[PDB]
Amino acid sequence: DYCTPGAFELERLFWKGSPQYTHVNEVWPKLYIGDEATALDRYRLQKAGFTHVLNAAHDTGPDYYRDMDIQYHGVEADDLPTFDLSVFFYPAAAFIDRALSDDHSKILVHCVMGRSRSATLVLAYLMIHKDMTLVDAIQQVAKNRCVLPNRGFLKQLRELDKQLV
């Protein structure tokens, strides 16, 4: 199916290809951030070898996923500066760490858009478990996916960054 693109389109890739703006992206090995369409398309998830879905915008159900050997968890968060997502940094990060402990695992962290809530949980994960500063973490994720945590989530990540340092 793939064919080598012509020059014009290769040049677009050098200029506009990165960070890519898509439904889902891998932001760290075996760790994907995506939107709702990606989480709901369960035939794609299973064929892509996915093993874990973390919904930072929990309704669908674990029965939707449990019929395919996918561990699900939903954090019931709103994408509003008045939601304290920091309440979930440690347990979401623990979920992600546990999943990535096994080599066979591939995890999708998602929300509606996959730009704010989910992004903030993966940032927190990288900080707590991969010894990253908030700046290093943002560089890791943002090069792979256009993300923008809301102003409140960002304040929360700054406070986590202060505690970790």
Feature table: binding site for substrate: 110-117
User: Taking CB under 8 A as the rule, does residue 48 contact a copy of itself?
Assistant: no
Sign of CA dihedral 29, 159, 18, 37: positive
Cβ closest to a copy of itself, residue 106 vs residue 115: 115
Number of residues that bind a copy of itself (CB under 8 A): 42
User: Taking CB under 8 A as the rule, does residue 107 contact a copy of itself?
Assistant: no
User: Taking CB under 8 A as the rule, does residue 49 contact a copy of itself?
Assistant: no
Among 14, 69, 104, 131, binds a copy of itself (CB under 8 A): 14
Near a copy of itself in 112-131, by CB under 8 A? 112-113
Assess whether 3 carries a catalytic annotation: no
In the chain, breaks (C-N over 2.5 A) are found after: 58
Query: 45-58 burial, b if ≥16 CB within 10 A, otherwise e?
Result: beeeebbbbbbbbe
Strands of the 52-55 sheet, one edge to the other: 24-28, 31-34, 107-110, 52-55, 71-74
Which helix (H) or strand (E) segment holds residue 138: the answer is helix 134-142
Q: Which residues bind a copy of itself (CB under 8 A)?
A: 2-5, 7-8, 10-21, 23, 80, 112-113, 133-135, 138-139, 142-144, 146-149, 151, 154-155, 157-158, 161-162, 165
Q: Which residues are catalytic?
A: 111
